[PDB]
Amino acid sequence: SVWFLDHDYLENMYGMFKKVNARERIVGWYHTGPKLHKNDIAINELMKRYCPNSVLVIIDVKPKD
Amino acid sequence: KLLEHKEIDGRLKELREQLKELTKQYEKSENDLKALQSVGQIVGEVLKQLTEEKFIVKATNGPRYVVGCRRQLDKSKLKPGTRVALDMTTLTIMRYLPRPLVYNMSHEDPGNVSYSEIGGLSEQIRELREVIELPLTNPELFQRVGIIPPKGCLLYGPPGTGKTLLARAVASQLDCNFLKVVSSSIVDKYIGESARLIREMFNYARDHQPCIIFMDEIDAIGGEIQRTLMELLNQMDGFDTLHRVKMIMATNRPDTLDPALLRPGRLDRKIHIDLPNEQARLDILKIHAGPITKHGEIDYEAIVKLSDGFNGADLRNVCTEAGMFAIRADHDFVVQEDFMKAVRKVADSKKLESKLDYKP
Ligand SMILES: Nc1ncnc2c1ncn2[C@@H]1O[C@H](COP(=O)(O)OP(=O)(O)O)[C@@H](O)[C@H]1O
Numbered sequence: 001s002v003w004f005l006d007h008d009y010l011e012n013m014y015g016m017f018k019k020v021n022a023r024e025r026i027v028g029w030y031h032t033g034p035k036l037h038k039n040d041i042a043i044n045e046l047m048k049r050y051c052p053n054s055v056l057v058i059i060d061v062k063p064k065d
Numbered sequence: 066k067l068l069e070h071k072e073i074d075g076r077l078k079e080l081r082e083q084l085k086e087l088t089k090q091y092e093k094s095e096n097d098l099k100a101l102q103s104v105g106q107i108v109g110e111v112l113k114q115l116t117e118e119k120f121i122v123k124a125t126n127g128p129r130y131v132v133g134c135r136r137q138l139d140k141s142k143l144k145p146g147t148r149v150a151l152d153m154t155t156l157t158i159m160r161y162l163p164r165p166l167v168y169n170m171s172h173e174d175p176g177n178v179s180y181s182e183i184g185g186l187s188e189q190i191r192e193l194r195e196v197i198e199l200p201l202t203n204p205e206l207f208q209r210v211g212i213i214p215p216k217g218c219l220l221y222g223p224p225g226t227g228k229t230l231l232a233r234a235v236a237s238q239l240d241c242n243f244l245k246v247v248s249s250s251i252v253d254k255y256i257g258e259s260a261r262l263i264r265e266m267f268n269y270a271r272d273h274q275p276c277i278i279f280m281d282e283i284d285a286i287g288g289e290i291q292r293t294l295m296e297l298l299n300q301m302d303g304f305d306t307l308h309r310v311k312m313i314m315a316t317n318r319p320d321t322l323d324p325a326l327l328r329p330g331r332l333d334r335k336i337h338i339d340l341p342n343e344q345a346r347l348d349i350l351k352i353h354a355g356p357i358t359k360h361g362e363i364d365y366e367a368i369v370k371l372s373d374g375f376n377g378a379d380l381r382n383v384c385t386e387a388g389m390f391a392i393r394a395d396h397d398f399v400v401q402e403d404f405m406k407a408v409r410k411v412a413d414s415k416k417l418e419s420k421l422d423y424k425p
Pocket residue numbers: 182183184185186224225226227228229230283315348349352353376377378379381
């Protein structure tokens with residue numbers, strides 16, 4: 001549970017992206033870990049704070065299968 | 066110290082409401098920023114459906130392209146003749162849109178003319194009902210007996226006597242859209258174009274607008290002239306009864322007819338309206354002088370005495386000039402005592418008319 005995902009960083013990256021393209025809305029988050037951790041529940045709730053129907057997409061970059 | 070705290074709380078409430086207004090303003094500004102990224106789309110017309118994914122669309126003022134639908138669209142809605150919004154880069158049909166012109170003089174809607182406005186046409190009104198109400202109210206009785214509905218009903222008679230008024234009255238009685246023909250978008254016999262005019266005649270009425278038709282130049286076609294008559298016969302001869310092109314004509318004179326139209330189905334009914342009756346003219350005076358501010362006693366029979374050989378439009382401008390001379394002599398009222406002299410001076414070469422003058 002000792003983690004840190006920045007709040008303001010997310011907010012102003014979205015500010016920049018919306019300024020570039022306002023059609024893109026926060027709709028979830030991603031992590032490259034092949035398995036979800038016990039920690040991911042907190043990050044998903046944090047994302048839900050920005051999008052109630054937030055969906056997290058696991059993208060296993062390391063394996064190609 | 067309670068009053069000072071309440072004062073600062075009230076100022077705080079005002080500042081919070083100002084902040085909420087700023088919230089609304091900033092959300093509107095962000096919404097317009099989001100709107101800026103949007104890009105317009107060309108307006109086009111679908112000429113033909115090529116395949117399940119290919120369409121031919123011509124821009125309103127540009128060339129025609131073979132394009133494809135965006136994705137989440139109803140291809141049923143995309144029919145030949147629908148207005149759509151092509152993307153300006155990939156030309157894909159993003160969405161469809163609902164659809165002057167020549168029809169700018171076609172409509173001539175009946176208005177709210179009812180039975181009460183028309184006066185002294187009781188037998189004529191009954192004739193219109195007996196002729197027209199069955200095709201409207203009970204088309205199934207014709208199937209019960211087994212005969213095509215009668216199309217050509219001729220309400221021949223002098224113009225300006227209320228022919229279109231009778232038609233609007235019955236139309237309002239059935240609340241049916243009376244599409245009186247104003248030539249444009251409905252000209253058929255007009256020899257300038259042969260079949261495109263036929264297409265406009267058919268499609269503009271009946272199909273788009275439900276039913277109830279008329280015709281302009283009321284005595285022109287009723288009366289190269291021989292070829293014009295043959296083309297008229299071809300236009301009117303006999304059409305599908307699913308779509309109504311009921312030709313309720315009201316030609317101004319009887320001698321402007323030929324036997325080529327007397328056949329039923331072509332021109333079956335011959336509703337005759339004669340010179341308006343003295344009591345009928347009386348009723349027309351009553352209804353038309355209804356609107357004018359007539360203070361005092363009005364003895365309309367005296368003005369009836371010298372109203373012979375008139376029409377309804379004559380009576381209408383009688384009332385209008387009553388108002389005119391009331392303005393000229395500064396009378397909010399209008400009495401019969403000068404109705405007499407006005408009717409004394411409304412009969413000459415050009416029916417005198419406006420010279421009736423003295424009327425309040
Ligand atoms: N029975 C009537 N009651 C009231 N007004 C009438 C009546 N008949 C005719 N009018 C008046 O006379 C005019 C009739 O013109 P109309 O007969 O419709 O000419 P057209 O049939 O050639 O278009 C209208 O302006 C109407 O105000």
